[PDB]
Design a protein around this ligand. Structure first.
Ligand SMILES: *[C@@H]1O[C@H](CO)[C@@H](O[C@@H]2O[C@H](CO)[C@@H](O[C@@H]3O[C@H](CO)[C@@H](O)[C@H](O)[C@@H]3O)[C@H](O)[C@H]2NC(C)=O)[C@H](O)[C@H]1NC(C)=O
Ligand code: I0I
Length: 357
């Protein structure tokens, strides 16, 4: 059995759109209001972590002073607890450290109170030197939380009952019209039908991956593998092993204005097999031109718990071509990721809907 969802429509204030600016350092940043009086920070919206990070004035490092740091001692709603806790996060190309606090946030005219978040205090490992980093809005599942009782998204849903437990991304950096939608989807960002993929593990937005084909060559999968939908990354990824076998069929090379145009016509078509669904990426989709060079828009990432069996899907090499919806399950019914073709057009996204049933 498989009961379907449906695109039932909601009123305008039940799906709100957060514009995302594609910064010249590959950051997809939006606007977020912290404290009272409001202090504006521009965080990344991430479906690969649930923690709410805010760069504060308690970080006096060189990469911290260049951005709009948040000053908790100027906020009237900030209230640290008597027995303050500390926070530690280690990722691939750096690290983030700080303390925990509770604050009241406003995300696109919606207010959220008693929101536990981490105040960034240190950033030393070297990657934050290339980025004007100001915070992270966590959109992953609550099991991925390092501290706090309720996840920001869960906490926002609890205090604004008009919002349905779902959000969606439309990536289009060229036109600068990419938008983050909370509480549903907008029919003007995609065309065709929307296909759902059940979430296997409520840690990342993770679904079973049945295979990967670059043209006709099978890169994966000989052992059960999975795909993770991460809006915090620009590149698609593969584990350490399969990454080598990939760069042998699509390698980088010098390219000119008339050399890259031909690369897009002859380069293979990558196919991602999600059970019955087959999602293809064309050469003009995953190939990028940098300093007169043709780079496969892929990088190596070994997911910790999934060894060499986890493949990530990023913003520039996937979501830019496919409108993605996130539907939070509950109890028996699972959470699911919806993929459709991106309409890649302005249209007039005044009418918005949500996935029910
Ligand atoms: C977190 O925010 C909530 C609301 O967003 C704050 O509410 C606290 O919880 C309830 C709701 O007002 C209050 O507790 C009880 O209210 C009942 C009403 O029937 C009363 O009979 C009980 O004797 C008790 O007062 C509580 O007063 C309220 N505020 C405080 C300061 O306790 C909550 O305060 C926020 N954070 C924390 C840490 O409490
Ligand atoms: C960015 C951090 C908040 C974190 C916690 C770091 C992090 O592990 N991932 C995924 C991820 C998810 C699951 C398993 C492994 C990796 C990922 C993947 C690949 C590369 C990057 C990367 O270097 N991202 C650049 C763009 C960037 C952005 C903003 C700040 C720093 C760095 C990130 C996040 N989504 N977020």
């Amino acid at each position: 059995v498989k009961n379907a969802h449906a695109v039932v429509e909601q009123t305008e204030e039940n799906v709100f759109l957060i514009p995302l600016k594609h910064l010249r350092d590959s950051q997809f940043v939006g606007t977020l209001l912290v404290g009272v009086p409001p202090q504006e920070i521009h965080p990344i919206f991430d479906t690969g972590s649930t923690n709410l990070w805010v760069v504060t004035t308690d970080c006096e490092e060189e990469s911290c002073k260049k951005v709009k740091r948040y000053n908790p001692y100027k906020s009237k709603t900030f209230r640290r607890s008597f027995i303050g806790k500390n926070l530690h996060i280690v990722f691939g190309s750096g690290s983030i450290s700080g303390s925990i606090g509770k604050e009241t946030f406003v995300l696109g005219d919606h207010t959220v109170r008693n929101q536990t978040f981490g105040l960034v205090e240190s950033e030393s490992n070297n990657i934050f030197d290339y980025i004007d980093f100001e915070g992270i809005v966590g959109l992953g599942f609550p099991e991925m939380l390092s501290a706090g009782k309720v996840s920001f998204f869960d906490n926002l849903l609890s205090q604004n009952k008009n919002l349905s437990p779902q959000f969606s991304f439309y990536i289009s950096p060229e036109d600068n019209t990419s938008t983050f939608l909370v509480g549903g989807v907008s029919k003007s960002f995609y065309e065709g039908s929307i296909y759902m993929l059940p979430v296997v593990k409520e840690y990342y937005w993770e679904v079973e991956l049945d295979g990967i084909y670059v043209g006709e060559k099978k890169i994966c999968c000989e052992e059960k593998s999975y795909a993770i939908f991460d809006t915090g990354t620009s590149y698609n990824t593969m584990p350490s092993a399969q990454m080598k076998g990939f760069f042998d069929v699509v390698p980088s090379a010098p390219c000119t204005e008339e050399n890259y145009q031909e690369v897009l016509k002859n380069y293979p078509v990558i196919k991602y097999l999600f059970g019955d669904l087959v999602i293809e990426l064309l050469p003009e989709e995953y190939m990028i031109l940098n300093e007169e060079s043709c780079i496969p828009a892929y990088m190596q990432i070994d997911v910790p718990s999934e060894k060499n069996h986890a493949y990530l899907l990023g913003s520039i090499a996937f979501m830019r071509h496919y409108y993605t919806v996130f539907v939070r399950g509950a109890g028996g019914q699972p959470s699911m990721v919806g993929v459709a073709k991106a309409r890649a057009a302005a249209e007039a996204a005044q009418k918005v809907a949500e996935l029910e049933n």
